Design a protein around this nucleic acid. Structure first.
Ligand SMILES: [Mg+2]
Length: 462
RNA sequence: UCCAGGUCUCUCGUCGAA
RNA sequence: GUUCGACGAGAGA
RNA sequence: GGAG
């Protein structure tokens, strides 16, 4: 992806937006209890912790575009993945507007607690001023879509979240692109049936993990990926994507049954326009993270990409024995024979992708069931029931979370939620976690679940 | 004086009235 | 208890 | 800009 052009929003008849410049995050009562290396991301150019230019840092992800055509490897990649998806019977018929907006099996309602994007954000207008799940009213919505139309600019915000202090110093904060309510609705009408079929079918046929519950899904993964493991990381995947990959996505969408007018919606993802503060800018390429379908489309593209690389690097690879599960850029895969991920990274480079060793490792060495991760979780077979597998989030990540709060009123919910992640590390580790929580006054006021109760509910869930 | 911060998935919690 | 609904939070991508 |  590449920022092609920047103009003042005033030139283009857009207002200055007003982007929150202060974190909601503050140290919690457990800040001194646990060790941690993360702090709230830099949100503004005048952050005292900055050791580099902030705006340069945040837009640096747009590394550029490769100018190459859809080659024979891509075509074969698209054909093979389209053949899997054909078994799922995805309807290309538009989703009913009420279902698209207020929810249906496999697809939750629009989030009414989030911004409505442009122009509503500059008009003081919220989603709740327009939509209500209690009434399921569409009258005010139809009228706002008629009035303001589609293909509105997305609004760039700096994401408020914890980051390593290294990334704080370099100002390497992440950006989100707020989709207009109108475009979210139009997207959901057009692709809603695809969305729900993916959500309902996580696994190696969609090549997607969206819709999964790691507590249950982790036990299925080794059954689905029974070959030699393949995993690697991407650097700035979303923003690294060149237009050729969107061209591929549109082709696979056509093979699914979508027409040109419908695939043209992808042009608004690939060739996108944005508001940041007092600027209006144009990006060619890059998946604008925050558009409707971000996860599904990033995952679909990841399925096209990794097939492409396999086919290019290894002639006589048999994709029918390839298995992969992607969640956006995150991926875990297998092939019956050892695949050199460093060679895939090499081919990836020519396609404008930056692929590095899994989990920020030093070399593209062997990926094993013991060291592989997915959705930041390790895999550990239950010692009692070896066919059941624990999703294991590292305690250090659980520690970073508990050390901060967006509101001390939520302490009970926050800490309970973390317990449900922590116990998969085992009873000893869990009790040490509970103990440190109980080492400060507030901790002793919390209702925390017993290890035995968690294990019991888990086994019961199967 | 106060508000402004995406798409989605999963899970937990508080409310439900069948 | 169980479903389905509305609201809050946490985590992941 | 929205609201009180
Ligand atoms: Mg990964």
């Amino acid at each position: 992806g590449e920022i092609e052009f920047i103009e003042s929003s005033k030139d283009a008849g857009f207002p200055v937006i007003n982007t929150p410049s202060k974190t909601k995050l503050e140290p919690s009562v457990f800040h001194q209890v646990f060790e941690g290396n993360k702090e709230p991301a830099v949100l503004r150019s005048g952050d005292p912790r900055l050791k580099a230019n902030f705006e340069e840092a945040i837009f640096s992800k747009y590394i550029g575009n490769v100018n190459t055509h859809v080659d024979e490897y891509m075509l074969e990649a698209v054909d093979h993945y389209a053949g899997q998806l054909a078994t799922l019977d995805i309807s290309t018929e538009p989703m009913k507007l009420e279902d698209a907006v207020y929810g249906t099996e496999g697809l939750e309602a629009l989030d009414l607690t989030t911004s409505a994007g442009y122009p509503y954000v500059a008009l003081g207008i919220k989603k709740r001023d327009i939509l209500s799940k209690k009434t399921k009213d569409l009258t005010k919505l139809k009228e706002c879509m008629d009035k303001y139309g589609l293909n509105l600019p997305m609004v760039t915000y700096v994401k408020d979240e914890l980051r390593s202090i290294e990334k704080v110093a370099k100002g390497k904060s992440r950006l989100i692109e707020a989709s207009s309510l109108n475009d979210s609705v139009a997207m959901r009408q057009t692709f809603g049936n695809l969305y729900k079929t993916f959500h309902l079918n996580p696994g190696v046929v969609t090549g997607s993990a969206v819709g999964c519950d790691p507590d249950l899904f982790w036990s299925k993964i080794p059954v689905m990926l029974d070959g030699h493991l393949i995993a690697f990381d991407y650097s700035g995947y979303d923003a690294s994507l060149s237009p050729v990959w969107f061209a591929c996505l549109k082709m696979i969408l056509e093979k699914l049954g979508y027409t040109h007018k419908e695939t043209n919606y992808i042009d608004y993802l690939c060739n996108s326009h944005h508001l940041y503060r007092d600027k209006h800018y144009f990006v060619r390429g890059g998946m604008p993270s925050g558009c409707s379908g971000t996860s599904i489309f990033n995952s679909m593209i990841n399925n096209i990409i990794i097939r492409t690389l396999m086919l290019k690097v290894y002639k006589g690879i048999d994709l029918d024995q390839f298995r992969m599960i992607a969640y956006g850029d995150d991926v875990i895969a297998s092939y019956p024979w050892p695949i050199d991920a460093s060679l895939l990274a090499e081919a990836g480079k020519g396609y404008g992708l930056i692929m590095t060793p899994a989990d920020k490792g030093e070399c593209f060495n062997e990926v094993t069931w013991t060291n592989v991760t997915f959705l930041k979780r390790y895999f550990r077979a239950d010692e009692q029931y070896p066919f059941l597998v624990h999703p294991v989030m590292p305690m250090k990540d659980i520690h970073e979370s508990i050390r901060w709060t967006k509101d001390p009123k939520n302490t009970q919910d926050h800490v309970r939620s973390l317990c449900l992640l922590a116990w998969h590390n085992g009873e000893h580790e869990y009790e040490e976690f509970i103990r440190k929580i109980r080492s400060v006054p507030v901790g002793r006021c919390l209702t925390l679940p017993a290890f035995s109760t968690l294990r019991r509910k888990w086994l019961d869930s199967f």
